[PDB]
Design a protein around this ligand. Sequence first.
Ligand code: NAD
Ligand code: NAD
Lengths: 330, 330
Amino acid sequence: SKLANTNVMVVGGAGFVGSNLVKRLLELGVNQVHVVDNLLSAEKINVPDHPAVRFSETSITDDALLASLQDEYDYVFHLATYHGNQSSIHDPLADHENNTLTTLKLYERLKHFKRLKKVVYSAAGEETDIVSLHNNDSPYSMSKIFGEFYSVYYHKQHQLPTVRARFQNVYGPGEILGAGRWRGTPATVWRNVTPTFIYKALKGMPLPLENGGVATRDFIFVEDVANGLIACAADGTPGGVYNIASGKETSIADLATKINEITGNNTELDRLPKRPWDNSGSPEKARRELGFSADVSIDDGLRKTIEWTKANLAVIEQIMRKHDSALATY
Amino acid sequence: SKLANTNVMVVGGAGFVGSNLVKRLLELGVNQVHVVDNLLSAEKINVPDHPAVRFSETSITDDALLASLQDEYDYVFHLATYHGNQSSIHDPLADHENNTLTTLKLYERLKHFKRLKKVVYSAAGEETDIVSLHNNDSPYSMSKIFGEFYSVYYHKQHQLPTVRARFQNVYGPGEILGAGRWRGTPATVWRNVTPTFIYKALKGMPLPLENGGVATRDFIFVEDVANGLIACAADGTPGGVYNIASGKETSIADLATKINEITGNNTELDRLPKRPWDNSGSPEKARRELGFSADVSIDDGLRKTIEWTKANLAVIEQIMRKHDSALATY
Ligand SMILES: NC(=O)c1ccc[n+]([C@@H]2O[C@H](COP(=O)([O-])OP(=O)(O)OC[C@H]3O[C@@H](n4cnc5c(N)ncnc54)[C@H](O)[C@@H]3O)[C@@H](O)[C@H]2O)c1
Ligand SMILES: NC(=O)c1ccc[n+]([C@@H]2O[C@H](COP(=O)([O-])OP(=O)(O)OC[C@H]3O[C@@H](n4cnc5c(N)ncnc54)[C@H](O)[C@@H]3O)[C@@H](O)[C@H]2O)c1
C-alpha cells in the first residue's frame, strides 16, 4: 500500500466512519495515526489504545491545536461533521462550528504543508460539480457542499491536494446509537435507519416502517467506505471528486425484512409495494481510476453489523441511556 | 413608498452601497434606520448625524448585539462583506467572520421575527439558482454564494422573507479609497477601478490600463443600486433573486477615456482594440416584476462621482494616507 509507514491524520477519527478507517489504516501498516476528535458525536471506546494512535480530544477549529500542527503528515482524512440533518436544523450555529468552519480552518492551516500527498474530504452523495441553491434540506447539507467549495478553492489557489469522496447511507460495526453528546433531538439516539432497525430487532420489537418502507437507498458497508477513502488518498486526482457507492438500491421494507430474518425478530412489518412515484451516485469513476469497487452485499454487511451489535449490546444500551432525560423532555 | 414610516436595519450601512441606501431611505421618509457596522471597510463620516439614524459600531456577529435585537423592523438590508476579493485571498478567516458567518448569525436571529416584511441580501452578480464549485476565484466569491444558500434555506425552513439582489460593478459617490482598516493588501486603498481612475485623473496622472483596457463590465450607478435594493424590499418575491444591473457594458479603455475627458486629465492612455477573445446579468426580471430600471448612464454617473470626489478630495487623501506604512511594506 502507498499508505504503509506513513503518518496520517483522521479528523473525526473517533466516529463511525473514522474509527473504521483508523482500524484499516493500522491493518495497512501506517506509522502513526493522529485522531483529532472532540467526541461531540462519538465515544472514546471507538478510538484504539494503540501505540501508533495519538488522540487529541479537541475540536479541529481550536486555534492552539491548529498552530501546534507540524508538516509531518503524508495524508489527512477530514471526516468531522455535526451529526446530522435533524441536529443541524435544530441548531444551525452548532452545525456551522462543527461542519463548515472545521473544513475552512483545517485547510487554511494545511495550505503551506509540503509533506501532504492527499487530503481526503468526506462529502455528501458521472460526478458533477454543479449544485442547486434549492437542494439543501438542512444546514448539514449546506455545510457538506461548502466543504466541497473549499476543497476546490484550496486546490486551485494553494495546490492543497484535495480529493472529495461522496458517499451516502453507510452502515456497519462501530455506529453506536446515542454516541456523544445530546445534539438537540431524538436523532442523537436514533441516528440512522440501519442501527435503529438492528437495535429494535435484537430487542424483539416491531420495526417502524415509514410509508410501507417504499423508499430505496444505496447502502454501502463501512469497511468498503474505509477502503474507498484509502483509494482516494492513494490514487485520487488532486482537485477531484469520486462517488464511493455500491451502485445497488435496497428498499427500507427489504432492509427491515433482512434484519428480521437475520436476528429472528418474529414481529409484523407494515410494508407496501413500491410505486414509480415513490422514488422518482455512479461508482464507475472510482472503479476505472482507483480500481475501487464496494462489493460487500447488503446481506453480508448486515450479518457483520448485527454480529457486532449483539456482542456490544450492553455497552450500546449504557450509551443510549445517557440521553433518557433529554429524550423524555423533547 | 411602502417604506415610508418603516423601521429599517442596514447591516453594513456605513459602507459604499450602504451609506447611499441609508440616504435614500431617509429621502423616502422611513421612521428609523438602524445602521450596524464595525467600520472594517468604512468611515464614520459615511453614516449620518441624523435623529432617525441609530448607529451600532459593532459586528453583526456579536452575540450580545444579536440577543439585544427586537422584533421592531419592517425591513432588513444585509450589505456587510469583507472587502473584497484580494483581501479575502490574503486572509480567508477574516473573510469568513465578516462575510459568511455574518449572514448565518443574522438570519438565525431574524428567523422568528414577525414584523419583517423583507430581508434583502446583496449577492454577487434570466437569474438561475445553479452554481459551479469551480467559479469562485476567492473566499469572497464563495462567501457571497454561501449567503445565497442561506437566504434560500431560511426562507424554505423558517419563512424568512429573503430576496437576493445580485449586482456588480457599482460605482458612485461615497466610495472612499482607503476606507476602514488595512485588510492586508493594496486593494484596501485601490478598492476598485472607477475610484482609482477618478483619483488618479484628478491628480493629473496617467491611468494605468491592464492589457489596453479590453475588459468590459456592466457598471451600475450606486443610486440605481440603492433604488433596486428598495424595489427588492418593497416588491421582491420572498425566496427570490433579481439582477440589479444596467444591461450595458463599458470597456475599461472607455471608462478611462471618459474620466479623462470629464476631469481634463491630459495624459496618455495605452489602450488596445477589444478582440472577440478578450471577453468570450439580465435586468429583465427586475424590470418586469418590480418596475425597476437602472437608467443612469455611465457618462452621467461618472460626472456625479467625479464631482463628489473633487469636493471631498482632501478628506479622501487623509483617509488614504493612514495606509502609507502598510502600502510601503507590502
Ligand atoms: N454515515 C453516512 O451515511 C455518511 C454519508 C455521507 C457522508 N458522511 C460523512 O462522513 C463523515 C463521517 O460521518 P459519520 O457517519 O462517521 O458520523 P460521526 O458523527 O460518527 O463522525 C463525525 C465525527 O466528527 C467529530 N467531530 C464533530 N465536530 C468536530 C470538531 N469540531 N473537531 C473534530 N471532530 C469533530 C465527531 O465527534 C465524530 O466522531 C462526515 O463528514 C459525514 O458528513 C457520512
Ligand atoms: N460594490 C460592488 O461592485 C458590489 C458588487 C456586488 C456585490 N456587492 C455587495 O454589496 C454589499 C456592499 O458592498 P460595498 O461595495 O458597499 O463594500 P463596503 O466594504 O463599502 O461595505 C460593506 C460594509 O460592511 C461592513 N462590515 C464588514 N464586516 C462587518 C461585520 N462583521 N458586521 C457589520 N458590518 C460589517 C464594512 O465595515 C462596510 O461598511 C456587499 O455585500 C458586497 O459583497 C458589492
